[PDB]
C-alpha cells in the first residue's frame, strides 16, 4: 500500500472531502492536482489536502 499520516485536523470544506483527525492513517489512491489527493479512511473514499499529511515509507 501507499499511505500517509494526518498531521493536522481538517474539517471538510466540501462534500467530496474527507474529514481528517490527527494521527489518522489514509491509504492513498492518486493525486488529483497539486495539493489534493484521493484516498480511503474508515471505508470512505474522498479528497484531502496533501499538505496536511506525511507520506510513509512504502513496505
Amino acid at each position: 500500500k501507499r499511505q500517509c499520516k494526518v498531521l493536522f485536523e481538517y474539517i471538510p470544506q466540501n462534500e467530496d472531502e474527507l474529514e481528517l483527525k490527527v494521527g489518522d492513517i489514509i491509504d492513498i489512491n492518486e493525486e488529483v492536482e497539486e495539493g489534493w489527493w484521493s484516498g480511503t479512511l474508515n471505508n470512505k473514499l474522498g479528497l484531502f489536502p496533501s499538505n496536511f499529511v506525511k507520506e510513509l515509507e512504502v513496505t
Binding site: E9, D16, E33, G35, W36, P49, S50, N51
Partner: peptide
C-alpha cells in the same frame, strides 16, 4: 515541502 495547515486552492471537483 513543509506541511502547513492551509489547504491549496481546488480546481477539480466530483
Amino acid at each position: 515541502p513543509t506541511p502547513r495547515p492551509v489547504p491549496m486552492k481546488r480546481h477539480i471537483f466530483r
